[PDB]
Amino acid sequence: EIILTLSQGLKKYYGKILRLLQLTLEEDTEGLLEWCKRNLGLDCDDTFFQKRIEEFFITGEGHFNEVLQFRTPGLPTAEPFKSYFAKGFLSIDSGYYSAKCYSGTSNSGLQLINITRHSTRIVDTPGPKITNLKTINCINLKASIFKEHREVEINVLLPQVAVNLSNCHVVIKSHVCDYSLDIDGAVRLPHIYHEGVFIPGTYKIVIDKKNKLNDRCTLFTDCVIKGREVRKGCSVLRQYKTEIRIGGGSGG
Amino acid sequence: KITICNGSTICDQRLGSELGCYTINRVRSFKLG
Ligand SMILES: *[C@@H]1O[C@H](CO)[C@@H](O)[C@H](O)[C@H]1NC(C)=O
Ligand SMILES: *[C@@H]1O[C@H](CO)[C@@H](O)[C@H](O)[C@H]1NC(C)=O
Ligand SMILES: *[C@@H]1O[C@H](CO)[C@@H](O)[C@H](O)[C@H]1NC(C)=O
Numbered sequence: 377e378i379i380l381t382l383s384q385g386l387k388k389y390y391g392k393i394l395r396l397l398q399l400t401l402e403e404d405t406e407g408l409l410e411w412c413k414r415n416l417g418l419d420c421d422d423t424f425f426q427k428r429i430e431e432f433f434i435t436g437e438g439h440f441n442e443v444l445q446f447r448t449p450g451l452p453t454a455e456p457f458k459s460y461f462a463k464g465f466l467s468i469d470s471g472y473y474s475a476k477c478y479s480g481t482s483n484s485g486l487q488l489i490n491i492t493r494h495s496t497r498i499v500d501t502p503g504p505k506i507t508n509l510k511t512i513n514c515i516n517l518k519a520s521i522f523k524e525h526r527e528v529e530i531n532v533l534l535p536q537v538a539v540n541l542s543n544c545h546v547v548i549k550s551h552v553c554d555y556s557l558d559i560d561g562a563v564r565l566p567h568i569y570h571e572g573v574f575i576p577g578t579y580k581i582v583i584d585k586k587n588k589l590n591d592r593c594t595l596f597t598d599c600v601i602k603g604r605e606v607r608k609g610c611s612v613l614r615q616y617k618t619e620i621r622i623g624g625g626s627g628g
Numbered sequence: 629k630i631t632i633c634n635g636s637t638i639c640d641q642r643l644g645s646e647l648g649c650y651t652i653n654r655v656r657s658f659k660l661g
């Protein structure tokens with residue numbers, strides 16, 4: 377048996393949240409349950425963690441503390457996390473991984489989409505298997521090349537459509553959480569469960585081309601395009617698999 | 629301004645408020661830091 381300190385268990389508490397958000401596939405929660413009883417006076421069950429996530433991102437009202445609890449607005453104290461914040465972000469940092477997550481009270485409107493309702497149903501169609509970064513023309517992707525920031529930004533407008541990294545070190549930015557990705561495959565997105573599955577409605581892939589590990593960074597994704605008119609003022613969505621090279625180019 | 633309906637169609641501004649639809653807005657503005 378080993379007892380965890382305040383900061384030790386808080387990092388494990390954030391590792392639990394990062395895991396439930398499906399930003400990580402691994403966790404270190406050994407000793408978290410006892411830490412929740414000793415420091416929060418409650419059983420931080422999986423139901424409790426869903427409520428913390430659900431409140432912090434969607435339904436939380438008032439000020440929030442470092443452990444995602446909400447409150448409506450001398451002598452030593454045993455109870456921690458009594459300092460709350462009206463709006464802003466929490467550095468959900470487990471030591472092994474971190475994500476800068478914004479409270480739902482910090483957005484003018486809900487920036488999460490209910491993918492249980494808005495799951496995509498797109499029809500494949502003929503299209504170039506290779507797409508040039510300067511000539512991306514997709515409904516789900518808007519690309520900006522900032523030569524002064526030494527950066528490329530890929531605005532993803534349909535997060536339901538996977539964007540797969542290949543030899544990339546990127547930073548994801550959104551109105552939900554900001555975090556770094558360096559592993560091949562589909563971009564991981566924070567998942568909030570609230571009577572359905574919620575993910576960011578939009579996000580941005582920021583690729584530092586100054587970083588030599590991005591020299592061969594490539595995105596594999598479907599390019600969503602507008603099709604034929606089916607109803608009054610609406611067109612059915614189409615998509616084609618394509619490869620977008622980002623890291624390449626020329627110097628000087 | 630892009631409107632996605634039933635995850636399978638894209639509609640113009642008029643039907644942006646219809647059932648099963650949601651809208652993605654491009655924001656262009658200045659703000660105080
Ligand atoms: C999310 O969508 C599902 C499927 O349409 C629906 O049952 C559920 O009520 C929605 N959740 C919220 C919180 O609106
Ligand atoms: C990206 O990977 C996912 C698996 O997560 C797969 O379903 C999808 O087809 C891939 N996309 C492309 C364009 O290959
Ligand atoms: C989405 O599907 C529902 C159920 O079939 C239908 O009532 C609605 O009109 C559809 N929306 C559009 C914009 O076609």
Ligand SMILES: *[C@H]1O[C@H](CO)[C@H](O)[C@H](O)[C@H]1NC(C)=O
Pocket residue numbers: 452453454455456457458459
């Ligand atoms: C205890 O609570 C008070 C609230 O007035 C302060 O936040 C103080 O720093 C806390 N101390 C500890 C050790 O958590």
